[PDB]
Amino acid sequence: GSSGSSGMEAVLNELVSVEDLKNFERKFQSEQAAGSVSKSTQFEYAWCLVRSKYNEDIRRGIVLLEELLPKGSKEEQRDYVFYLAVGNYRLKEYEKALKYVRGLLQTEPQNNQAKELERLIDKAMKKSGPSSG
Fold first, then answer.
1. Which of the residues bear the PTM N-acetylmethionine?
2. DSSP label at 36?
């Protein structure tokens, strides 16, 4: 009611919009034919992808995200992992999500979003998981 923006349950809930994705997908593409896509747009579109309601995006989103991970400085990886997990989680990739939400928490303990997620994925597993065997 009147402006939402809960915290995390809203971030995950809300997904990217074609209108936007297109806006980014355009920069990414253009930038490409421009001479070379800049990490900037890279993380953008990527984050835009993962955000997308489609899984495919998450797939073609993580890669980039995982591409900027090592191609990141420091705090840059903080904004990355955070997503890698978001996108990973979407693929019920808790194992990874956490692995990312964990290492991200190590550097970002105060980060609530990370905290929540940790629990979110935690519940996810219980809700529905692959299980071993």
1. 8
2. S
C-alpha 103/C-alpha 62 separation (Å) is 16
Buried residues in 50-75 as b, exposed as e (16+ CB within 10 A): bbbebeebbebbbebbbebbeebeee
Please state the three-class secondary structure of 70-107 as a single string: CCCCCHHHHHHHHHHHHHHHHCCCHHHHHHHHHHHHHH
Q: Single out the residue of 73, 74, 96 nearest to residue 86, CA to CA.
A: 96
* DSSP single-letter state for residue 131: -
CB neighbours of 54 closer than 8 A, spacing ≥ 6?
Answer: none
Method: NMR
Q: Which domains does the chain have, with CATH numbers?
A: 1-133 (1.25.40.10)
Residue with structure tokens 């489609």? Answer: 54
